[PDB]
Amino acid sequence: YFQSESVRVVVRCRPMNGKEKAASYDKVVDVDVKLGQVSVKNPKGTAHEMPKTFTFDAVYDWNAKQFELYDETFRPLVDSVLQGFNGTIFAYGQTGTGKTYTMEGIRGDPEKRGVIPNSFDHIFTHISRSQNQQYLVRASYLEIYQEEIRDLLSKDQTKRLELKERPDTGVYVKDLSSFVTKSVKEIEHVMNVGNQNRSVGATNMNEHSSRSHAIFVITIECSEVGLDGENHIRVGKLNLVDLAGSERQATKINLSLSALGNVISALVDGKSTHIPYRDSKLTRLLQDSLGGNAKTVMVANVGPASYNVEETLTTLRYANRAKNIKNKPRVNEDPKDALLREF
Amino acid sequence: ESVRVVVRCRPMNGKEKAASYDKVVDVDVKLGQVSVKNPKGTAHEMPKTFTFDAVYDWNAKQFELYDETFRPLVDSVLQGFNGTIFAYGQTGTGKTYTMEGIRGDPEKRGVIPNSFDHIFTHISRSQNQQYLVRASYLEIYQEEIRDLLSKDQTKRLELKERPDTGVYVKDLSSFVTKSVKEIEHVMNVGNQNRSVGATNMNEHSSRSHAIFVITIECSEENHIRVGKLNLVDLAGSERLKEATKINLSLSALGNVISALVDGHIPYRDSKLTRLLQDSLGGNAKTVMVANVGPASYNVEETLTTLRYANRAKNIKNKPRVNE
Ligand SMILES: Nc1ncnc2c1ncn2[C@@H]1O[C@H](COP(=O)(O)OP(=O)(O)O)[C@@H](O)[C@H]1O
Ligand SMILES: Nc1ncnc2c1ncn2[C@@H]1O[C@H](COP(=O)(O)OP(=O)(O)O)[C@@H](O)[C@H]1O
Ligand SMILES: [Mg+2]
Ligand SMILES: [Mg+2]
């Protein structure tokens, strides 16, 4: 061995909510933070079946704080992008479990803001602290819905963008818009406009956002004179992904979710198996995040109630598979696509 | 009735002349056209030419625009229609000049004060009619509404809806105005309040939307008509962009206009588009003023404005007397 890297997988179980309490659902999910374990009871108990237990890199219970999640699990990933790695954070699980609460949270609120806005603060504070380093940060924001890509930052919300792929390039979204951002205020405003554009259709956003994938992309370039006196540029891409609801697995089947499951499963079956990246826009776009040149963290969001036990178990099984995925991340050094080369 | 669209091109300024920029915008009042030429000329490339309801060059005076374009709109509000006039275009092109103008020279007064004069002189001449005129003044900045007339400038107001009359700004202050002097005072009060909290007033006013609202009730079977006149001065208007001019209300405005002219209209997506819902495809007459500058330096933004304005001409409204 040479001192590759596993996809990091964490589970977060949200509090039982008022609707669930009012319906008298039982709490069947138990989280053991010390052991990094989640146990799921059968709603009929051991009179029917024994409980299922899973182990993860870390687990977070109903009392987990947004900022502690951040510092323990997400910060090192963001750190890596600040040093020129590609990094991906994705939230997976059933509608209503807390993917968006985890990814976006309550912006403007330091206690309740999620990983995206925490990453903004981390990134720009890091930049302002640095010396003898030049940074350029820019953001894109896109939605995948019905296997088409919509640029949430574009003035034209009717156009759909195509994925292209070259040996020079890797896969990329052709003609995707990007905003250069110099501060937290600027990148927050980028997210505001994308979120506003996201609702351009009639279907209520609760339903629409459940049925689509949102990907916020922070590209961080850094230029610094090395000990060899040469100007070295590194470029890392931080993909921050809030997936469609995991229950959506004919038109009810989300093809990017289904492809994601097959990719995860193929990557960990222990065989030389075909990995079907091309079977969806999501898995094509995130190909490096799943077996490739990136560091990746998966947050598997679940809720505690007996009523949702089946979807919870589905989530936990995929999460348990994903933790065996091996990536091979590298610092992305002096790439041809670097805007900082202009200066 | 279609949204009326006019273009106004300001004079070349001193800095532009000093930098030796070419004048690339030509205006033909006879054809109602504006032409953007290549400095290399027609042996190289043809000008981009657009047609509008009216066009006004750098020499056109405030009162020419008023009597030709704005007056019929204000006439309609005096007859019980909703009417809207909005100024759109690049920062520095003349939106504010057109809407507010400059007080000290009567000839330089913009559509807002000119409308005051027209409305109150009309009312003073009226036989067999009773008018009541009310004014409100608000700003939209960062998708929040500030009442420019309230004492507390830290408060923000929500939009609510009534089942018959539609959207309104909850708790917005409204002054009854009996004269030009009273309504001008309301404008002066609001324009003072606008700079409250601004780090740079010119940048702030370029990034926000100002909406002066005149509600004209007329009593004259007993008829009561009510028409709302919205007078709007908008924010300035891999694909790499800069985050600093992001304007959430303008984004929404674009999506609304696109959906209206394509052959769901997302009015609810922003404060501006909810307030302007009637003005854009609804129960109002509407005039758009597309402001542009003449210099070669700004040509791409000028063209973007003209294309935007060209599309807006296609919006179909359904104005009724509100009786
Ligand atoms: N850890 C948590 N603590 C408190 N409230 C939460 C938590 N996770 C989710 N919620 C709440 O539950 C609701 C559903 O969460 P959301 O993130 O929208 O679900 P989805 O997984 O569908 O995006 C929201 O009202 C959100 O505030
Ligand atoms: N038609 C015009 N004639 C003369 N000066 C003008 C005209 N339009 C604008 N200006 C002047 O040009 C400058 C910028 O105009 P302004 O209305 O402030 O632009 P905007 O509101 O579009 O940013 C101001 O000094 C203004 O008085
Ligand atoms: Mg969600
Ligand atoms: Mg102005």
State the virtual CA torsion across A130, A131, A133, A136 in degrees, nearest 10: 50
A179 touches chain B (CB under 8 A): yes
DSSP H helix total and E strand total for chain B: 10, 15
**Non-local CB neighbours of A69 within 8 Å, separated by 6+ positions:** A10, A12, A60, A102, A115
- Vertex B81 angle, CA B78 and B85, to 5°: 85
3-class SS shares of chain B: helix, strand, coil, % to 5? 35, 30, 40
Ligand 2 geometric centre to CA of B276 (Å):
25
A164 touches chain B (CB under 8 A): no
Q: Three-class SS of residue A111?
A: coil
Do the chains contact at A157 and B258, CB–CB below 8 Å? yes
- Vertex B205 angle, CA B203 and B209, to 5°: 135
- Resolution limit in angstroms? 1.8
> Rounded to whole angstroms, how far apart are CA atoms A37 and A30?
8
Strand partners, B161: B167
> Rounded to whole angstroms, how far apart are CA atoms B282 and A258?
43
Q: Closest by alpha carbon to B8, among B309, B297, B316?
A: B309
Tell me the pairing of strands B83-89 and B224-233. Answer: parallel
> Rounded to whole angstroms, how far apart are CA atoms A60 and B162?
45
Q: Closest by alpha carbon to A241, among A77, A104, A90, A26?
A: A90
Judge whether B286 and B83 are in contact, CB under 8 Å.
yes
Backbone φ, ψ for residue B52 (5° rounding): -130, 175
B174 touches chain A (CB under 8 A): no
> Rounded to whole angstroms, how far apart are CA atoms A15 and A34?
19
- Widest pairwise Cα distance in chain A: 71
> Rounded to whole angstroms, how far apart are CA atoms B281 and B258?
11
Both tokens assigned to A217: 């992309």
* Ligand 1 atom nearest A91 alpha carbon: 21
Both tokens assigned to A322: 């994903």
Both tokens assigned to B52: 């509008």
- Which numbered ligand comes closest to the C-alpha of A246? 1
**What one-character DSSP code corresponds to residue A214?**
E
Judge whether A23 and A312 are in contact, CB under 8 Å.
no
Strand partners, B108: none
Say if residue B104 carries a ligand binding annotation: no
> Rounded to whole angstroms, how far apart are CA atoms A91 and A299?
5
Chain B neighbors of A186, CB-CB under 8 A: 243-244
Both tokens assigned to B227: 């028409």
Both tokens assigned to B158: 């929500």
Tell me the pairing of strands A5-6 and A231-242. Answer: unpaired
Quick one: closest CA in B to A161, which residue? B238
Judge whether A175 and A219 are in contact, CB under 8 Å.
no
Buried b (16+ CB within 10 A) or exposed e, A264-275: bbbbbeeeeeeb
Both tokens assigned to B82: 């909703």
A192 touches chain B (CB under 8 A): yes
The residue nearest atom 8 of ligand 1, judged by CA position, is: A98
Q: Closest by alpha carbon to A256, among A232, A285, A230, A228?
A: A285
Backbone φ, ψ for residue A64 (5° rounding): -60, 140
Both tokens assigned to A325: 């995925």
- Which numbered ligand comes closest to the C-alpha of B237? 2
Long-range CB pairs of B101-105, under 8 A, 24+ apart, other chains included: B101/B62
Tell me the pairing of strands A29-32 and A37-40. Answer: antiparallel
Chain B neighbors of A190, CB-CB under 8 A: 243, 246
Other beta carbons less than 10 A from residue B317's beta carbon: 20
Both tokens assigned to A94: 């059933």
Q: What stretches of chain A show up as alpha helix (H) in DSSP? A: 18-22, 66-69, 75-82, 99-103, 115-129, 184-198, 205-210, 255-267, 281-285, 309-322
Judge whether A77 and A240 are in contact, CB under 8 Å.
no
- Vertex B277 angle, CA B276 and B281, to 5°: 115
> Rounded to whole angstroms, how far apart are CA atoms B256 and B202?
28
Q: Three-class SS of residue B167?
A: strand
Q: Closest by alpha carbon to A308, among A101, A13, A107?
A: A13
Ligand 4 geometric centre to CA of A3 (Å):
61
Backbone φ, ψ for residue A168 (5° rounding): -65, -20
List chain B gaps (C–N > 2.5 A) by preceding residue.
220, 237, 263
Both tokens assigned to B109: 């007064």
| Integer Rg of chain B from CA | 20
Strand partners, B2: B316
Buried b (16+ CB within 10 A) or exposed e, A190-200: bbbbbbbbbbb
Q: What is the 3-state secondary structure (H, E, C) of A133-170?
A: CEEEEEEEEEEEECCEEEECCCCCCCCCECEEEECCCE
Q: Closest by alpha carbon to A310, among A99, A93, A103?
A: A93
Q: Three-class SS of residue A72?
A: helix
- Vertex A69 angle, CA A68 and A71, to 5°: 60
Tell me the pairing of strands A213-225 and B159-162. Answer: unpaired
> Rounded to whole angstroms, how far apart are CA atoms B49 and B127?
47
Q: Closest by alpha carbon to A192, among A157, A158, A152?
A: A152
> Rounded to whole angstroms, how far apart are CA atoms B205 and B211?
12
Do the chains contact at A179 and B269, CB–CB below 8 Å? no
- B93 CB within 6 A, ligand 2: yes
CA distances to A32, A312, A323 from A53, rounded to whole Å, are: 10, 12, 15
Tell me the HSE value of B156 on the side-chain side, using a 13 A CA sphere: 8
Do the chains contact at B269 and A199, CB–CB below 8 Å? yes
Say if residue B305 carries a ligand binding annotation: no
Other beta carbons less than 10 A from residue A180's beta carbon: 18
Backbone φ, ψ for residue B258 (5° rounding): -60, -45
- Nearest CB among A176, A197, A202 relative to B264 is that of A202
> Rounded to whole angstroms, how far apart are CA atoms A61 and A216?
26
Both tokens assigned to A328: 């091979």
In this structure, chain A runs to a length of 343
State the virtual CA torsion across B185, B186, B192, B194 in degrees, nearest 10: -160
Judge whether B273 and A213 are in contact, CB under 8 Å.
no
A157 touches chain B (CB under 8 A): yes
- A100 CB within 6 A, ligand 1: yes
B126 touches chain A (CB under 8 A): no
> Rounded to whole angstroms, how far apart are CA atoms A241 and A226?
33
Tell me the pairing of strands A231-242 and A87-93. Answer: parallel
Q: Containing H/E element for B255?
A: helix B248-261
Q: How many CB pairs under 8 A join A and B?
A: 63
Q: Which amino acid is at A297?
A: V
Do the chains contact at B240 and A190, CB–CB below 8 Å? no
**Non-local CB neighbours of A242 within 8 Å, separated by 6+ positions:** A90, A91, A99, A100, A103, A104, A209, A213, A214, A215
**Non-local CB neighbours of B169 within 8 Å, separated by 6+ positions:** B136, B138, B145, B147, B157, B158, B159, B275
Strands (E), B40-82: 48-51, 54-56
The method of structure determination was: X-ray
- End-to-end Cα separation, chain A, in angstroms: 41
A200 touches chain B (CB under 8 A): yes
The interaxial angle of helices A309-322 and A255-267, nearest 10 deg, is 50
Do the chains contact at A186 and B244, CB–CB below 8 Å? yes
> Rounded to whole angstroms, how far apart are CA atoms B40 and B273?
41
- Tell me the DSSP string of A220-279: EEEEEE-TTS-EEEEEEEEEEEEPPPTT---TTS-HHHHHHHHHHHHHTSSS-----GGG
The residue nearest atom 15 of ligand 1, judged by CA position, is: A98
- Vertex B195 angle, CA B194 and B196, to 5°: 90
- Nearest CB among B240, B259, B262 relative to A180 is that of B240
The interaxial angle of helices B71-78 and B111-124, nearest 10 deg, is 40
- A246 CB within 6 A, ligand 1: no
For CA atoms B63, B67, B69, B74, the dihedral sign is: positive
User: How close, in Å, is residue A268 to chain B by CA atoms?
Assistant: 35
Judge whether B55 and B28 are in contact, CB under 8 Å.
yes
Q: How many domains does chain A have?
A: 1
- Out of B15, B57, B69, B97, mutate this one to test ligand 2's pocket (max ligand atoms within 8 Å of CB): namely B97
Q: Which amino acid is at B58?
A: W
Buried b (16+ CB within 10 A) or exposed e, B213-247: bbbbebeeeeeebbbbbbbbbbbbbeeebebeebb
- Out of A10, A11, A13, A14, mutate this one to test ligand 1's pocket (max ligand atoms within 8 Å of CB): namely A14
* Ligand 2 atom nearest B8 alpha carbon: 1
- Tell me the DSSP string of B12-32: PPHHHHHTT--B-EEEETTTT
**Non-local CB neighbours of A41 within 8 Å, separated by 6+ positions:** A26, A28, A29, A30, A51, A309
CA distances to A95, B29, B60, B279 from B54, rounded to whole Å, are: 53, 7, 12, 19
Judge whether B81 and B285 are in contact, CB under 8 Å.
yes
The interaxial angle of helices B111-124 and B180-194, nearest 10 deg, is 160
**Non-local CB neighbours of A231 within 8 Å, separated by 6+ positions:** A223, A224, A225
> Rounded to whole angstroms, how far apart are CA atoms A295 and B78?
66
A-contacting residues in B 214-273 (Cβ below 8 Å): 238-244, 246, 248, 251-252, 254-255, 258-259, 262, 264, 266, 269-270
A175 touches chain B (CB under 8 A): yes
Both tokens assigned to B99: 């809407």
Residue B152's CATH number: 3.40.850.10
For CA atoms A332, A334, A337, A338, the dihedral sign is: positive
The residue nearest atom 16 of ligand 2, judged by CA position, is: B94
> Rounded to whole angstroms, how far apart are CA atoms A264 and A214?
20
**What one-character DSSP code corresponds to residue B161?**
E
Ligand 2 geometric centre to CA of A78 (Å):
46
- Which numbered ligand comes closest to the C-alpha of A31? 1
The residue nearest atom 9 of ligand 1, judged by CA position, is: A98
* Ligand 1 atom nearest A99 alpha carbon: 21
Judge whether A201 and A120 are in contact, CB under 8 Å.
no
Domain range enclosing B186: 1-323
Q: What is the 3-state secondary structure (H, E, C) of B202-246?
A: HHHHHCCEEEEEEEEEEECCCCEEEEEEEEEECCCCCEEEEHHHC
